[PDB]
């Protein structure tokens, strides 16, 4: 669970990603927007990205995809893009922020 940073805020995540991260580095943190949920924060060129993960009945929901555990979700997005740009750029989770 090297990627789980706990209750770090969105701002703290932005700073940490920019100070210590390279593109593809990411963290999972508690959501500041809803109590039992999470955010995936990803270092990306120009502007970092934040994705919602909603925990419902022990299932981790992101977009229209569902995962048994946060680990499964994270591993999925190392192998399938978590974001795709208009110019064909596919962004993947690569590594927990160090």
């Amino acid at each position: 669970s090297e990627w789980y940073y706990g209750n770090v805020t969105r701002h703290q995540a932005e700073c940490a990603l920019n100070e210590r991260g390279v593109e593809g580095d990411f963290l999972i943190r508690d959501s500041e927007s809803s109590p039992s949920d999470f955010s995936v924060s990803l270092k990306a060129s120009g502007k970092n990205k934040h994705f919602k993960v909603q925990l419902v009945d022990n299932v981790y929901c992101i977009g229209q995809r569902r995962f048994h555990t946060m680990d499964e979700l994270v591993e999925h997005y190392k192998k399938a893009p978590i974001f795709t740009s208009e110019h064909g750029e596919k962004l993947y989770l690569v590594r927990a922020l160090q």
Binding site: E32, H50, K52, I62, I82, F83, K90
Partner: peptide
């Protein structure tokens, strides 16, 4: 806070 759209 605004969140980014996850890729399908």
């Amino acid at each position: 806070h605004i969140y980014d759209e996850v890729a399908a």
